[PDB]
Amino acid sequence: PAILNPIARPEVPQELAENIILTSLNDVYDWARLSSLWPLMYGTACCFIEFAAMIGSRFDFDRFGLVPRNSPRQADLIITSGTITMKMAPALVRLYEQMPSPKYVIAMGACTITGGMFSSDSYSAVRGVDKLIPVDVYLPGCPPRPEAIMDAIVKLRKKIANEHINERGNLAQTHRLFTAKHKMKPVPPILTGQYLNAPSRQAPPP
Amino acid sequence: MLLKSTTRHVHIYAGHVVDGEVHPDTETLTLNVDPDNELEWNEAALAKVEAKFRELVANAAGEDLTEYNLRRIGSDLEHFIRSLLMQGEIGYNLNSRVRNYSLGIPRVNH
Amino acid sequence: PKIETRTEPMVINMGPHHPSMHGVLRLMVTLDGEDVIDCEPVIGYLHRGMEKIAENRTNIMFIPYVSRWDYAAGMFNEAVTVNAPEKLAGIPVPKRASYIRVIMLELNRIANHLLWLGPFLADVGAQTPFFYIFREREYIYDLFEAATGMRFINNNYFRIGGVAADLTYGWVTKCRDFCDYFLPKVDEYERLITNNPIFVRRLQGVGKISREEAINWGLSGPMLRASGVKWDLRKVDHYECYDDFDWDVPVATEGDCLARYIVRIQEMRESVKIIRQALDGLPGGPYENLEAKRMLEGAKSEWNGFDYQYIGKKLSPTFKIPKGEHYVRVESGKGELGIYLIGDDNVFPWRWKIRPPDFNNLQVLPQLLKGMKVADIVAILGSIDVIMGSVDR
Amino acid sequence: GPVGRLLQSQNLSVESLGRDASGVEMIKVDRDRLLAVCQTLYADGFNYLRCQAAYDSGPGQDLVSTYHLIKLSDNADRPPEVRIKVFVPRDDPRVPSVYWIWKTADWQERESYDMFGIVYEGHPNLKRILMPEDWVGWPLRKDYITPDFYELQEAY
Amino acid sequence: ILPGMTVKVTNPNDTYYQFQGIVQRITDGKVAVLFEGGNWDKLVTFQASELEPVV
Amino acid sequence: AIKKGDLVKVVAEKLANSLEALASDHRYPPYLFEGRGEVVDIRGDYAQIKFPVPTPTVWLRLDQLEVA
Amino acid sequence: GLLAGYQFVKDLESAGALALFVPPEGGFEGRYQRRLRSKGYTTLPMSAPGLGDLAAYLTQEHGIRPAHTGKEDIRVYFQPPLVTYHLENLPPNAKGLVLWLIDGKRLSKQEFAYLAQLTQTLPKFKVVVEVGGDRVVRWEPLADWVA
Amino acid sequence: KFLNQITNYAKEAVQSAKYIGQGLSVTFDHMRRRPITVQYPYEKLIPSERFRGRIHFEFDKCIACEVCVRVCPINLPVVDWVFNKELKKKELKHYSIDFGVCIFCANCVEYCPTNCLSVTEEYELATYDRHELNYDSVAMGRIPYKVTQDPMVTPIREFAYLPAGVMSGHDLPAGAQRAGERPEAIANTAKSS
Ligand code: SF4
Ligand code: SF4
Ligand code: SF4
Known part of the structure; x- marks a missing residue:
């Protein structure tokens, strides 16, 4: 109750290394994971259309090594592109977590870092993706100039270089987990096929 | 199939983790408080979170097993964690990772 | 590790994470041996609450929301949200601001058809036209960024009494240069496609609705006009500055993907025919000559009258839209956008509604998949110009 | 009005609200004989809907199901463009479905149901397209109290 | 040049050629011209040598 | 009497037994009774209430309120 | 260059405030930040386009007023200083607290001079500023580059 | 009956080869442009x-009209004033805009009477944290x-x-x-x- 939301004052600090033959190899490691970030084609709204224009030929992002990839597993980056409603959010955590561990995030737009215009009087928007996953770089602006995304990638590339190779302990999950028996009466799934084969579509009632 | 509530630093499921799988059982309700290490946990405050979860499932739940309800539980836990993190029991990790203040910046309580 | 085959129809999920542009959309589809019986399309992944946000937001406060329904063309809906309270108050609109409205809005139609065309071909094979449209559709971005501030979407260039801001100096002859540069290139596309067999053999006769079967399901846009129906609200409703131009409303009759493609690609030429015919008829011409002729003598002359101004009386944020309900509509690329507005007496509306064309057009996804294939789905889904942002209401 | 005097001769009467600032007329077709009026109009070449969703007349009085109708002749001039309104009580009741007379009512009525609580007696796939199907609350009513979800609060 | 003083631009190698605008702020030799015109007021930093203190 | 500076507090009980609470969910927000309900509109007999959390307004009536 | 030792750390410990003229790609500067972290220094970049007087955010205690959106009428938070709080939240064996600023072009001469003078006072504290530019990563004392 | 089938077969083959070579020549022409x-x-x-990038702000021209909040779609800019008692003047004590929330519609710029509040051509905004985008009165002028x-x-x-x-x-x-x-x-x- 003196400094709210405080910092924790760690001990046993980091035990970094200092030899040159390892830190040059660390520079190569970071340069390699750096200059070949492979995004995930994750589109939800006009931020994706600006990302599509970023793919284009007025200014690509194929240079400094970015290949738009379709699956998470091969990917390295979610340029979060659009609004995250409360019905697609687990379909974003299940894309982020379902991905290899040295992975990064960019949050383009204002509808996905505070909810933007939908940060008020909306009842189905997530007011910030930073309360779903660890955002690594923020860039503002509903539709931002897609060359601003390349500013964000510059700013992300000078953060991949800010990493170290004997520091990958801050890259896993601890899984502080529990269990609890309950009683909440499971219901059947009402979400199946049966859109035209249902009896009520082929049946004017009496 | 699973019915989960995946916010940040609260992930709730409806199965039993055997070694890393989940195996939905319809009655175990696991939890995975703060996997990404946004916060630095003690032995006491974490037990308070555990007890909040236990007396929030059993004490008030007698209706269906929708994701709506688990999402509501996750919201109550993510507000309880604000309370613990404001009062000053736990704090941010400070490590050389992201350091994005999802919950809040530090105040002084004037 | 394996899956235990059985003699039953297979259910597969084409989830939110499409590897494409056609919004985020589920299609829980059930198939009988690389066929399709039906599918439950679980849309809803992009409901953020427009129709209840539009009740604590006055007109000028809400108009930037409006351009997020059709992410491709954010002026077919700014125009409608303008026209809705504009009719109740009976605010006269000039010919200049309405010709500007026509020009910019039809230019957005061009953009919309291009953004339909790109992923329509990417899902149907090669990616090169996706790169050839953002080589070309990127010029109207610069046009808009000159006239309005931002590019595709978020312009918020339109206002109730007309248009917010008069044009820039060198906009008109440059739009003419674009108009002249475009027609040689809609032909280069037809050199690269429209006869390539590996393309046209992919979508010969997939999808079809009859005339009257496309009217129960109300497929208001080109889908309704790609089945033998001469009907467009630019002509039958006498939208603002029309009957002053030449017209050739395209129609096909096959009802299939060719009947949509040919209609869209002829529309994206008829649109240029409108634009070239509008620039030669402004009340004032280019803003350069207009402002010069005003300042030369016309501190009182007829080149400063109401019909030559870009707006009537500029309004406050307390316009206080009057009472009385009505339904406005506009024929966009996907089809008929519509707004059922009511109003009580105050700045905040009462039941703002959106009637998007994509919603009704996307109703009939499964009928078009009444036993076709698993791999000719995207060819059909890419035909409507589905923008899931236009299904948030 | 013209449509009013027309279907008055078809032996079923409905109120008249006048016109709505565009030449369109409005009639309060009642709940029970709604399908009969709709079938007479579809017989008299009203084959296209153009909107269906609803509005709330206020917090306590009653709901509405505002339809809209049109003749839709090919290559036409300004058509008649009528609509009809169905006041329904608040707590329990509902309306019938017009899906079988003419379509466009499937997902439109499904979302009106989703956002206002208007059941549609005789509607297939009467589910929630928006608003995850496990949801509860009937959002767009004037009296709706949202939950205290964590992803709805702030970027505090 | 000093604040509050309207100016214009004399630089054919600049898109803001021959626009009149009011100076807003001056720091470290570069002056922020404010182009009251159109609808949205625009603000841009020009060097003192690109300008011409019109009356 | 309800005038110029005083905020409101939904009470507990006149809300969910009077045939008009059936829209929203049975259980209630943990921001239930905190006296922050700022004065925004009254339509003769109706009330409109903010609830200062960016999640939309609500239209209530006489029986459901107290002034703190 | 293609390989560099720790002379950057010596230059920084000597001058107190350097100014990087890295290229506009942001790929060949974080390694020097690593070389600093490989010694015991701890970093905090906080993106100068967003810093104010730079005497209220670094030395003194200032008032941040968050975004109200019609809801939650105006309120302050009073976050503590950025340089007397992280400097006290160091580990035990901490050599100092370096300070990185990504976009330095947007700032002015006065606060460059202020950050330079602030290295001597408040001892365990150093500064670096990424003023974009040259096609080879070279640096210069920040007391220089001004006057 | 059978010869005609083979001729139509070869015709389809030749037309396909031709329509492929057409796109071949097209793409081989695009690689000189x-x-x-x-x-x-x-x-x-x-x-x-x-263009509507970052918002500008002067501290000396503001008069605390609250139009900026009353016109923004979401009531964003944080004006804070105290009303000193010399005669009537509202004294402006603080002014901020969270650019992680701002939408760049510039209606704020449009209705500010004093020409205090303007748009700049800064599109290069980005941070490692969103509590740095909350720009203060002395961090909004800042000379683009x-x-x-x-x-x-x-x-x-x-x-x-x-x-x-x-x-x-x-x-x-x-x-x-x-x-x-x-x-x-x-x-x-x-x-x-
Ligand atoms: S931030 Fe802007 S561009 Fe991105 S989804 Fe929201 S409205 Fe669209
Ligand atoms: S509109 Fe202008 S004068 Fe009014 S508060 Fe904003 S900056 Fe100050
Ligand atoms: S640009 Fe729009 S959202 Fe931002 S301060 Fe101005 S009016 Fe408000």
């Missing part, structure tokens, strides 16, 4: 005279960037600022102007015959 790519960090693009005055940039004009007939903006003379005359020149031309 100059790239329209904009090599951004070294070849940045110049924004227009109406001006792309051209950058020693390591080759600026490019966009399609509305290129000479008539010109389409790209890469290899241009050093005296190019937009399309046509300004109205001042037209007026002084008509006045002088």
